[PDB]
Write a protein that binds this DNA or RNA. Structure first.
Lengths: 180, 207
DNA sequence: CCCCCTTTTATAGGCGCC
DNA sequence: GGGCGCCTATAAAAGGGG
């Protein structure tokens, strides 16, 4: 055991309202809405609790972003569906699904990326001219990690919380072996 | 239409000559291109983007790395797209390249700056030591090299400007100032023990 | 086939512009 | 020189537009 639990930072989920929508009306009536089709084809809405931001499409499908938990992402997703409902639309809540989860943590010691890239070239990409962090594409679980010399680590691409935890457990030993 | 390789080799040739690259490099580039092309590994991209990435790879494989900025300069493609293609190509060809080091640019940079061999060596030394002592963690090797050159040149009669170095190394002078600020505290321990200080280690620029 | 648009987030060196 | 704010990179969905 690493004895470290990576903290969930962002969850992206989708849900289908079932009925087609009219962004113009929504944008107009809804308070915290925003709609500039010239700029982006969807309505951008934001609730403060769960602190989130949503992307609502005229197709009826929407994207929920910003929640720090699956429970919270779904809650926000429902609140969004409600305001749409309340503005008079046959809004349903079909196929809610978590699409991506992001986690981050600190192994608490500096890392020798130079070394890690040497023995792990197969999964690594560390080009200082392109990005200051080492990009690790783990195969099992299919998660991408961003490793920094400071010891901070970011993990993403997860469909479920377990994948985040698993990937970190897999990488911890490796990282320890490259401690400065 | 695959004999569109000829047009790729022409373009490769063109780019290469703008910076006078030896033939081994151009040959390697052509091989890389041919291999990626025939593999049909990078669908949907522009041949010149792939060619420019191939060029960038070739210089690194042949042991004389050019910065993405330099390859960009002689190319119709952006750093961003060359970089994307670069990563995609290494994966398709199951290849890799050795991480870049300060030493990889010391020679050419110092030459372009018309710096006397003595300085070039000092810089090279300062950079290597600096990294060994972990004074510039996280910084790009190009940045650290630029700062070392600056430090070295400022300790010599053949002094160079942050701006001059930056233009040749392709880094902004604040970027130079940042790494320089980090190595400055150990300036005495960084120069080669037998160094002819035109300007004493102390009177060195105190950015 | 690919990229862009936009949103969110941790992370962080480099750099345009005032 | 000083420092803000955006670039670069990661994943992913939405649905066009190119």
């Amino acid at each position: 055991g690493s004895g470290i639990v990576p903290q969930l930072q962002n969850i992206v989920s989708t849900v289908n309202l079932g009925c087609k929508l009219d962004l113009k009306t929504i944008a107009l009536r809804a308070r915290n809405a925003e709609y500039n089709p010239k700029r982006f084809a969807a309505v951008i809405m934001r609730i403060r609790e769960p602190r989130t931001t949503a992307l609502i499409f005229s197709s009826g499908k929407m994207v929920c972003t910003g929640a720090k938990s699956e429970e919270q992402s779904r809650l926000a997703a429902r609140k969004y569906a409600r305001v749409v409902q309340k503005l008079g639309f046959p809004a349903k809540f079909l196929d809610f699904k978590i699409q991506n989860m992001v986690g981050s943590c600190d192994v608490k010691f500096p890392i020798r990326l130079e070394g890690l890239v040497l023995t792990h070239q197969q999964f690594s990409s560390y080009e200082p001219e392109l990005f200051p962090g080492l990009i690790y594409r783990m195969i099992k679980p299919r998660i991408v990690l961003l490793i920094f010399v400071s010891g901070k680590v970011v993990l993403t691409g997860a469909k479920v919380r377990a994948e985040i935890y698993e990937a970190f457990e897999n990488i911890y030993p490796i990282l320890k072996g490259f401690r400065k | 239409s695959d004999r569109a390789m000829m047009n790729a080799f022409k373009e490769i040739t063109t780019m290469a000559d703008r910076i006078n690259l030896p033939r081994n490099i151009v040959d390697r580039t052509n091989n890389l291109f041919k291999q990626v092309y025939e593999q049909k590994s990078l669908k949907g991209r522009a041949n010149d983007a792939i060619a420019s990435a191939c060029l960038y790879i070739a210089c690194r494989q042949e042991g004389v790395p050019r910065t993405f900025k330099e390859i960009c300069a002689v190319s119709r493609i952006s750093k961003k797209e060359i970089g994307r293609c670069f990563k995609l190509i290494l994966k398709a060809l199951e290849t890799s390249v050795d991480l870049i080091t300060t030493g990889d640019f010391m020679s050419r940079f110092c030459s372009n700056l018309c710096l006397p061999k003595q300085v070039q060596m000092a810089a090279t030394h300062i950079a290597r030591k600096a990294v060994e002592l972990d004074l510039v963690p996280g910084r790009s090797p190009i940045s650290v090299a630029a700062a070392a050159i600056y430090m070295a040149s400022q300790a010599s009669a053949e002094k160079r400007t942050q701006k001059e170095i930056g233009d040749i190394a392709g880094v902004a002078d604040v970027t130079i100032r940042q790494s320089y600020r980090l190595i400055y505290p150990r300036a005495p321990d960084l120069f080669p023990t037998d160094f002819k200080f035109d300007t004493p280690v102390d009177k060195l620029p105190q950015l």
